[PDB]
Symmetry: C3
Subunit: 298 residues, 3 copies
Amino acid sequence: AMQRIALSDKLELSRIVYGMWRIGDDADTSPAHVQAKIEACLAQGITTMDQADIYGGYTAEAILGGGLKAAPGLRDKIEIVTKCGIVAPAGRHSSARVKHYDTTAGHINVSVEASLRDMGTDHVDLLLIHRPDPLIDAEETGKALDALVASGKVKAVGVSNFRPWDFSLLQSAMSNRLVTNQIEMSLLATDTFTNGDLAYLQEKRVSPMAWSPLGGGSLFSGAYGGTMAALQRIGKEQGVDATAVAIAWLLRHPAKIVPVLGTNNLERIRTAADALRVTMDRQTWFELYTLAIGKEVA
Amino acid sequence: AMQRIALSDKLELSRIVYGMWRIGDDADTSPAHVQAKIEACLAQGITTMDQADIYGGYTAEAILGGGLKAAPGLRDKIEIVTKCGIVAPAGRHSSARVKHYDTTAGHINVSVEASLRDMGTDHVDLLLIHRPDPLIDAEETGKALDALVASGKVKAVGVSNFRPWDFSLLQSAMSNRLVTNQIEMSLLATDTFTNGDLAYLQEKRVSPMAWSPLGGGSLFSGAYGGTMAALQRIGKEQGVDATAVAIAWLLRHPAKIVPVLGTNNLERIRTAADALRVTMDRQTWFELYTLAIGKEVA
Amino acid sequence: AMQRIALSDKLELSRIVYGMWRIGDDADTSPAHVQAKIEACLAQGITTMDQADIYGGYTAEAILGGGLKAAPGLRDKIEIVTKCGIVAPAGRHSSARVKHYDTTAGHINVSVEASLRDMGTDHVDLLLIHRPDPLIDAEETGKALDALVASGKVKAVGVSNFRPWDFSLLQSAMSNRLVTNQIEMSLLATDTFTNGDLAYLQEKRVSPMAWSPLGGGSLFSGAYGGTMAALQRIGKEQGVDATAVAIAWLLRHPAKIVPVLGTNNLERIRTAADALRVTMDRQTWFELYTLAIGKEVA
C-alpha cells in the first residue's frame, strides 16, 4: 500500500495490488465508477491494478479502458498488470470449441494489442502467462515475451500458476528475467509454503503475487471458526478487521508476497491497506497457520 | 517413420519405433515371420526396433535373433534398442527368488553379452537402464555404461521410467550424455505433461520415448467413450484409424516424443506411419487432452 | 560403528549413532546410568550421540550433562549432535502460546548457549536446524550458522527433515557446506528412496542421517507382520535380532546412510553394532523393500 516493492530495475508495484477480475460483473461499469474504484485505491497508495484478457469474458480490460480513456493522466498514476494464455469460449473467442491454452507468439501479440486498445495505452507494466501450458514451445513463447519487452509494449514479464519446472523451462528460453509468479496463497492455500513452489522463488529472489489472498471468502463462511476467532482477537488487539490480519499473515512471510485483493466493494477497498498496520510476530503467524491447517507443526 | 530423429550425433531413430515386447506372444515366432514384421516396418521407414533382456521371459531377443541370423544384412538396416536392470524369476533368471533390479557393472555386462549373442550382432544402437533402481550406485552404473560406449558394444545410452532426480543422479556419474528417457505417455497416461517429468526433458533437450502410446490396449476397450468418439471423428475426417490419431496426439508435442508401437498384426504395422499423416492443431490437442483428464483445463 | 564416516574434513561420526531422544523417559536419569549407556556405546565403537534442545521437554541435554560432568574426559570420547528450531510449550519455553519454529539468529544463539551449559562443554560437533521453517529467513539463519562455525562453538552444521528445496535455499545463503540432512528412513518409511529426497543427497555426495530406523517402535506394532517375519528369519540365519537386520537394510544403501538408534534398554545398546555384521545381498534388500511397498517392484 504505502510500501512499494521493486520486482526489477524497471518495475515497482504497490505491496498490495487491486484485483480487477470482477470489475465487469458490477452492475455499474460506468467510466465514473471505474475512476472512483482507482481513486479509492490511489488514496491508500495502491497503484497496481491486476487485469487479464479473459476477465469478464474478455470485457474487463475494455471496462477499465472506459475509465482511463475518459480521465487523461490516470493511466500514468497506475501500474497495469495483464495476462494472456487462456482461450475460453467467451466474448471475442466465443467460437472456441473447448477451453484451451495458447502460448504461441501470434496469440500473445494479438492479446497484448487488444489489451493496449481496450485500456487505451501504448504499454503495460507487467504481462503474465496466465497458466502453465502443457503444450508450451518454450523457445517460441520466450522469444515472444523477449520481443515485447524489446518493443517497449511490456515493461516486464512473468508467469502465473507455474510450477518450478514450468518457470525453469520458460526462463531457460528467455534473456529477460521472469519477475514474478502469481500463485494462489492464503491461510486456506498453504501448499506452496512446504511443497517447494515458494522455496524455489525465494532462492531465485522472485516475489510471488498471491491471488485469492483471503481464500475466496471461505475464511468467513463457516469452516474456519477457530482461524476466524484468532483473526478477530488479533484484529481487536490492533484496531483492524479479520481481513487486514489475514493479509498481514501473507505480508509477514520473508518471500515478500504481493497480495492481489479483487473486490467491487468501495468500503473494502478503503480498508484494503490496514494489513500494513498489523504487527505479526512469529508465534502469532504459527498460531494462525496451525489453526488453518488443523494440526500442530511436526 | 518417413521422419527421422537425431537423439545424438551418433544415434538417429525412426520417429515411430516398433515395439517387439509381444514378439513371443505371436503363435508364429519363426525366423521368416520375424523377417516379415521387420520388412513390414522397413516398408514404412520404421527402422528402430525396441527390445529388452526381460521381454518374453528372456526369449524375445532370441526370437528376433532367429530372424536376423537367417538374413545376414537385415541388422545393418535397423537400429536395435535394448534394456536391462530388471531381474524377474523367468528363463535364464529362474533362480532369483524375488523380482528385483540389478544395476551392477557385472549384471549390465552379462545382460549386454546375452543380447549380442541372442540377436547375433556385435553392437546395439541404444542401451537403456529399464527401471530406476532404489539401490543404484550411480558411480558404478555410470562407469559401466561409459565403458560399454567406449568398447563400441553400445552406440548410445539412455534410461526408462526415470524421475528427473534419477536422471540427474545417473547423468552426474557419467561422461556420456543419456540420450532419452523412455516413459509411459498416452491420452490415458498424461501425468508427465504437468508433473515436471516432461518439462525436465524438454529443458535438457532430451527426446522421450513413449511406451504404451495407446494405453497398451485400454484406450479402445470402450471405457473412454468421449475420447474414442473424438479420435474416431478425427480419424474418419483424415482417412486414418483412431490409433493413428492417438499417436499423432503425442507427435504434436514440441518435446519431440518418439512413440514405441508394439503389435504382432502385419496390417497394423503396414499402417503404423499413418500417425505422421495426421495434422493436429492446438485446439484439437486440447480437446483430446480435456476428454482424457475428464475435466476442463484450469 | 567400528566403521566411521567423514561428513567433512573436521567431522567424523560413527556409522551407527546412539539417539538420546528417549533418555528423559527412563525412570533412572542418574549420572551413573547415563554413563552406563555411553560406555555400552563406546565398547562397540559407537562414539556419536544424537541430542536436541527439545528432547525430554528441554531436559535431555541436562540429563546427558549429568553423566559427562560426573566423568571428566568422557566428552572427549564422543561426538555430540544437537538441534534447535522447534519451540514447544515445555520446560524453559513453557511460556510459548503455540508449538512453533524459530530459526532467528537470537533463538539459535541462545539454544546453543543452553546446549553448551547443560552438557558441560565449550562446543558441539554438529548442529542441525531440526525442522524446515516456513518463516525461515535463509540469509539470517545462514549467517547465524556460519558465525557459530567461525566461533568454534559448532564444528559443522546440517539440517533435519529438510526437503531438497529447503536444503537448497538455506545452502544458497551460507559459506559453510551443510554436511547432512537427518531424515526419517526405515522399512516403514521408504518414500525418500524414490521421491527425489535421497537422490538429491546422493548426487550432492551428502550422507543422510536416518532417524526412526525402526519407526520409533511401530515396526514391531503388529501392522508390519510380513516385514517382521522376514527380519526374524534373516536375524536367526545370521545370529542377530530383527533390529540389527532392519538397520543393516539402511546400511546396505550406497548413499552411506548413518542410522540413529534411540533406546534406553542397556542390552539393546550392547548389541546396537550387530547391524554391521549382517550380510545384506541385493536380493534380500529387495525382499525387504518388496515387503515395505506391499507389491512387486514395477
